[PDB]
Amino acid sequence: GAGSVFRAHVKHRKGAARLRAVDFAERHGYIKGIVKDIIHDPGRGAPLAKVVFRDPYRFKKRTELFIAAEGIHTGQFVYCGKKAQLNIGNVLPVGTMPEGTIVCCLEEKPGDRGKLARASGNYATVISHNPETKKTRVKLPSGSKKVISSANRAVVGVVAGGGRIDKPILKAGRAYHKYKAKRNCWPRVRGVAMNPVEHPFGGGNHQHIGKPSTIRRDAPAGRKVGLIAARRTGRLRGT
Amino acid sequence: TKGTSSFGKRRNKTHTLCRRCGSKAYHLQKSTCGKCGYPAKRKRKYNWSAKAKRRNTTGTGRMRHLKIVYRRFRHGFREGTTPKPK
RNA sequence: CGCGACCUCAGAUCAGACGUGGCGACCCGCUGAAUUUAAGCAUAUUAGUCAGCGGAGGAAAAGAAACUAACCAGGAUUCCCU
RNA sequence: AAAUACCGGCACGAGACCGAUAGUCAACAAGUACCGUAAGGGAAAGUUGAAAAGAACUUUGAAGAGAGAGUUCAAGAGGGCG
RNA sequence: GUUAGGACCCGAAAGAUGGUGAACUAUGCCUGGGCAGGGCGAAGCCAGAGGAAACUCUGGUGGAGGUCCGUAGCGGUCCUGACGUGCGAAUCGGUCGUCCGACCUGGGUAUAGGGGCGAAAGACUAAUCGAACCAUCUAGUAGCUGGUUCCCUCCAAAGUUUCC
RNA sequence: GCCGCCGCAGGUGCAGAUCUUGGUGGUAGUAGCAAAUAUUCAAACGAGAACUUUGAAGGCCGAAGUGGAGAAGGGUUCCAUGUGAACAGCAGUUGAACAUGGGUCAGUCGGUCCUGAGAGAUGGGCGAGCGCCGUUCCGAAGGGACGGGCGAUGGCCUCCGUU
RNA sequence: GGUAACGCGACCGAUCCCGGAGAAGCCGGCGGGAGCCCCGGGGAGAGUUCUCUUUUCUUUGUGAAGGGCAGGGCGCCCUGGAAUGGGUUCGCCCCGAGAGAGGGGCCCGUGCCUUGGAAAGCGUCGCGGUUCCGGCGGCGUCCGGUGAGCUCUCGCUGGCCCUUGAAAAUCCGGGGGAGAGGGUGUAAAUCUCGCGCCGGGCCGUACCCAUAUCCGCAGCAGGUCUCCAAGGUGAACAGCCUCUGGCAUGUUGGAACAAUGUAGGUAAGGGAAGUCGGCAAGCCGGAUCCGUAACUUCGGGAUAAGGAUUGGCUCUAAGGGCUGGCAGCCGACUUAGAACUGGUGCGGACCAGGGGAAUCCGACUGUUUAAUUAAAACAAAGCAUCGCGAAGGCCCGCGGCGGGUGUUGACGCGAUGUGAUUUCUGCCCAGUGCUCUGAAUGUCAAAGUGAAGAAAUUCAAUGAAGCGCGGGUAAACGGCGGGAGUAACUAUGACUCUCUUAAGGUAGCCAAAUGCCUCGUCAUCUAAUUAGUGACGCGCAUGAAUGGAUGAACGAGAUUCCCACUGUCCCUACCUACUAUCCAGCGAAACCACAGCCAAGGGAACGGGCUUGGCGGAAUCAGCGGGGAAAGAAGACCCUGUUGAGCUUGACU
RNA sequence: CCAAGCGUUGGAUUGUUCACCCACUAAUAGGGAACGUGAGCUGGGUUUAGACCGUCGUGAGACAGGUUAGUUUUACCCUACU
RNA sequence: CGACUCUUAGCGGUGGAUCACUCGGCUCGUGCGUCGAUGAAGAACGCAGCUAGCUGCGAGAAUUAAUGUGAAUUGCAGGUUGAUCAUCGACACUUCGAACGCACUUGCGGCCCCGGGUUCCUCCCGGGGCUACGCCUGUCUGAGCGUCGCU
């Protein structure tokens, strides 16, 4: 997967999905923009959303591509900055917004344009606060909770296109078309189903592995294959 | 099927005329010459094929500036003057 | 705010002069094998050789000692005999 | 600077060598006919006679092929012809 | 007479540099073209009747899906049939598998040899693949095969001994 | 054009190497010119008619064509005048052979002109080296315009292109 | 100009800004308009006439560009407010967010009229210059009617997606109002109105497009991308025949009609008795009307299985539109029933499933060894582990602020494990893997730090990770015992002890696609069965995501038996097509010490040639397949070689 | 004992060489002929390359342990025989 | 008797050894020691009265001048005031190629000056001259909260 025949299929896809910049508006007060269409993008079973903000130094109309928060609809108003009202699809920094509220398309560095929580059905909740240091705790999707920098922001709600793991894909084709609008990756051939020279696991009379399928973190390539650095193994009971 | 049926799927060309060596060996998709590497600033030539070099050096073609340096050489590169009249 | 000196740095179809590429038999600077010898083979051998890249000239390169000596001392460099 | 090196280039002079399956791949429209998509691979093939004097006229045939005339010291040298 | 040398001539399976190929096929991308006639009848809807309520029966309408029969197209089961100095360095014939979907094909494009591509057989990479092709190093090395050109005259062996 | 005697010198003597190159036999006038239905009668050109040319009969393809026109690729094979050697696996009057002589005309039908997957210069950076990486990323990357004003053209510097 | 949707011939003006167009998937249903096909009548020329036939065929026309009207579609505007709900499609679907009714407006208008345009074109009939005509004259180039027919187009409406179905050159329309034009004149700027005048360079343009001009060494049964597509029977671009246009049977003629072949048929009586095996062949087949089992994941199974009906001609009955519960006229199909009738003949050729009752394997569709394996292999949805919060995991690279996953962010990228659903998935951390703890602490290199010594050198303490010590783990790789004794007939063993390991095989499931002994043994199918299926478990070596047990559908997959039907057999016959054969013309190959009748004998132990016997009579045409240890390729098996390569780890470096 | 004159058959399970059962029969004796006989057939078994188990090995791999699918070339020359 | 089969000889076919010739190679030696932006080496297309190949040459195309030589060239026809032949010093050389306005489709441009549409008047058809990178010497126009200066 390191190049050529694999690289992601980008043509019918509809934009890269970000926040705004930051500027004097977001930084000393607030700005308002309107929503002009919710809109589907491929390689990403969740919807985007165009939003005409008006540029505040020339006559113009800027136009962005947020990650659409459920409950948004068209025509509606989006008011944002360091003051703006905490309701839904209204953006303002973690510094400001209270504990308990849910967020999406959250930032990690102050000003980086949103890197966390934009896949379908993902949050990044706010827990606690410490205003000498200017730091904040945020429970992310994997159980853990990042210390974060208190001036770094997130649109309010929960991400659109919710509940996609539900339905059984049935037919093998429905896979193909899922994985024909992403990258060369599918009908996946097992490692024991390769000769001596084509995968280390496969070879001989039966179709066994032979070697234990855990391996050192500190292997080289060609070998680091299987369960990597595996803390434990088996059917997971208890917790 | 590998043999003579698939020999009948031909209606296209990899190479054509180079425009330096002139040698039907200029690879379209890759766009340098197979004989000389046309885009490349100097030539291509090599010391592992010698019957390769001696199809193609300073004797071979016309020599049309050179064959009259050698002649101009041997008295003393005379320029300007003209032989005595009648 | 202006005016002037320097320093460091743009742009030109500004005025006049230079370089590229070729041939490569002999010369200079790099980089650089394995067949094969060892009655096997890893150090050794092939060999600083083959192939690769670079620069020249009518020759190149070297060159008037941080030199050889151990003598009653020879006195830049290259080349042949030893 | 010289005394050194020079199977490429420009002219030259020789040979106890080879003599057209030899000697260079090449004595001749050869790095040419032709093969390979391309890198590349790459032949075969010298000789009438002193002179063209290269056989008017006749005759069989539709035509090639023939019979007699004739040039030459010879066609028992008749245009891939000692 | 022994030896180093291309060393009496002819012969490997290998190994080593530097170079040419995706015009067949393997796969990812851009852009055009293509696919008889029949069968089965899922949701959604129209009345017609039964019951206290839920809701249920009878008749129509409708046009699904890696659904069936089956043509063009793509493929290649059995005859272990023909052909086997052939028409063909893998054809042809009757019978066969699929045929609105992970379908079937033209053009432009990316991937290069311990390297690519693989619904995975060590498959495919220009009639070559358990490591493609072209030139050189190279006349590569051989306790092993095959050959080894004129006459007469004279003498004429060995397969046993130690050490490898 | 060549040979004997005394002396020199060496790329010096063939039956063979599934040896190299050239030429010729037996087999042999033998294997063979068998896939997709089929021909026959008259004439006229001629030194030569089972096959060409005209006319009449009987047939096949059967619009998913043995029909009519294109793109790749071929490169003149297109079309008339002749020729009978060779070739077209019997024959030739025939031929896509041979020899001579003609033939491809556009604002409106294409390429050019724009981008697609993708190819790739400069700034930078890597590099012993020819060179490689990268394509918006360490860049002073725009050489143009309607007007405000100075002073210079052209045609009666009147009015405007031209700096 | 109009209430207004919007209309009229023009209808000034910059930088800037906003949007339109170029700009889109595939599949179903219905409607409009051309081409084409059909049907009744009129012209002109043909064909046929023994008899009939107002007959059978040929042919019958108008470019672009402009104006005018039909034909189609509207998510366009007005008055007006509707349950006793209404409007309406094949399906839908619409409405106090304004329906029915009435009246208007905009876009396409490839159809008919118009100028073009009859002056040309086509059909026929007749006259000139023999030539050398785009010669010249005449008639004609009509009128009606149908449609789920086929082909192209144009619109309206529905379905599908964890699949949402290109870019930009180019060109228009708007908001805004920077400005500009001249003082009622001759008027000015200004026009996206009509007329007019000058101009468009370069390269390609012939022909084949293939059972003859392209690739396959050739005029090669191979292979190579599209466009248009008439009548008849049919469900039909199927199969068979025919028009338009095409062709000379595909590098040969003539004569015979032998044995072998290659491709077609037919067979009295029996019917797999043939064979490894029903291999090959044959049987069934179209549509209408009845009728249909196990089993099931309720969807299927299912054309199950099993029957009957079907020709020809003479009738009857139903199913529509248009003009003004009735009258007139206009009309293209089907569908049901009855009768007469043939030597019991009708899907008359052509097209066109053999059926049933089980065992295993793989859920299904899909892919795969081009050129000896299409499968039980690969992939698959579903299940489960594993790493990872970007200074990041996984990965490429000789190198650089290098690149891929990524225009991404945990319902996310990467790495393995089994294989749809239902029911289930027991014990073992001693062993290796992998992992988490650290000064509880034995091994520890570079570099230093210090003292001894005249230095060259040596000793002493300090001492990373990794190894030792101690936790986590089997949907991580696998592994899951031995022996004596006991019941009132005997077998039998519920019970009892005793040695051992990390436990010691828990659910289930068997002489299997897996059991040596083995053709295991009771039962079932046959006259007879190393076969097939139903139980018994002792199981050499069955056992649970290294998967265990089961199951509807499915299969060019492996296996058994019954009804059908057959030249597969008893036992072979005869016919047809093409060769073979004989003749004229053309005319190659492999192979070849020398050659070519046998016995026995010896001999490198199986002679055509030697020795002893038998014997030996030109030259040849068709066959055959005993012998030449026949040809075809320096044995592919085995062994040697101090000859190699592809694979793998605790071999060595 | 002389006698090898004339015969010594049809079926089920199995790839069989061998084995065992049904039925008929004068009888269902045994053998050679390159273990007679593939340019006479068949390829059903073994004994290539695909695939699945059941033991062994950490493994590439291995099985007189079992399975499924796997292309049978030439005659026109001499002889022989017709 | 005859065909056919084998041997030998004569003469003919078929084939191209052997011999004899050589404007060609091989080896040694000597001497000189010269490519290029002023456009190389190498390619491509053109050039004869009759001409395809080798040769030689460039729209001045089997070559033009000049110096020398002094009556040809030739395969057929026609055409001494210097034929033909060697020398090379004056003149000239299509398109590509390091290859140079931008680009490889023989395609689109910008800058000036000339003859024609003219009566520069832009657009129009012809003809000419400049329009690549890198780098050194200096000249012109400029940038900098770099370092200072004086009002």
Q: How far is the CA of A123 from the C1' of D69 (A)?
A: 125
B62 touches strand F (CB under 7 A): no
State the resolution, in angstroms: 3.2
B40 is in an annotated binding site: no
B33 is in an annotated binding site: yes
Q: CB under 8 Å to A73, separation ≥6 — which residues?
A: A35, A38
What approach was used to elucidate this structure? cryo-EM
With contact defined as beta carbons under 8 Å apart, do A90 and A79 qualify? yes
The sign one gets for the Cα dihedral A221, A223, A226, A231 is negative
A180 three-class SS: helix
Neighbours of A222 (CB within 10 A): 8
Q: CB under 8 Å to A103, separation ≥6 — which residues?
A: A94, A97, A117, A123, A124, A125, A126, A154, A155, A156, A157
Query: What's the token pair of residue A128?
Result: 């606690």
A77 three-class SS: strand
Which residue, among A39, A41, A40, A65, has the nearest Cα to A51 in the 3D structure? A65
Q: Distance between CA A45 and CA B85 in Å, rounded?
A: 98
Cα dist. A61→A13, A54, A58, B86 in Å? Answer: 23, 4, 9, 93
Q: Distance between CA A234 and CA A237 in Å, rounded?
A: 9
Q: Beta partners for A147? A: A137
Q: CB under 8 Å to A167, separation ≥6 — which residues?
A: none
Q: Beta partners for A63? A: A52
Neighbours of A43 (CB within 10 A): 14
Which residue, among A131, A34, A29, has the nearest Cα to A83 in the 3D structure? A29
Task: Determine the residue type at A118.
Answer: R
Query: What's the token pair of residue A200?
Result: 């280390």
Neighbours of A182 (CB within 10 A): 13
Q: How far is the CA of A5 from the C1' of E75 (A)?
A: 28
* Residues in chain B, overall count: 86
Query: What's the token pair of residue A192?
Result: 């024991």
Q: Distance between CA A68 and CA A108 in Å, rounded?
A: 19
Query: What's the token pair of residue A158?
Result: 């929960």
With contact defined as beta carbons under 8 Å apart, do A86 and A97 qualify? yes
Strand order in the sheet with A145-148: A125-130, A135-139, A145-148
B36 is in an annotated binding site: yes
Q: CB under 8 Å to B15, separation ≥6 — which residues?
A: B24, B25, B26, B27, B28, B34
B29 is in an annotated binding site: no
Which residue, among A188, A212, A217, has the nearest Cα to A201 in the 3D structure? A212
Q: What is the H or E stretch that residue A135 is in?
A: strand A135-139
Query: What's the token pair of residue B11?
Result: 């209606």
Q: What is the H or E stretch that residue A148 is in?
A: strand A145-148
Q: Which single residue is written with the structure tokens 């770094």?
A: A152
Q: CB under 8 Å to A92, separation ≥6 — which residues?
A: A80, A81, A82, A83, A84, A86, A153
The sign one gets for the Cα dihedral B36, B40, B45, B46 is negative
Specify the nucleotide whose C1' lies closest to residue B49 (CA): E135
Q: Beta partners for A125? A: A139
Q: Distance between CA A82 and CA A97 in Å, rounded?
A: 9
Residues with CB under 7 A from strand H: A 195-196, 202-208, 210-211
CA A99 to chain centre: 22
Q: CB under 8 Å to A226, separation ≥6 — which residues?
A: A201, A213, A214, A215
Q: Which single residue is written with the structure tokens 């990403």?
A: A44
A232 three-class SS: coil
Specify the nucleotide whose C1' lies closest to residue B41 (CA): I98
Radius of gyration for chain A, computed over Cα atoms and rounded to the nearest angstrom: 23
Query: What's the token pair of residue A49?
Result: 């959303």
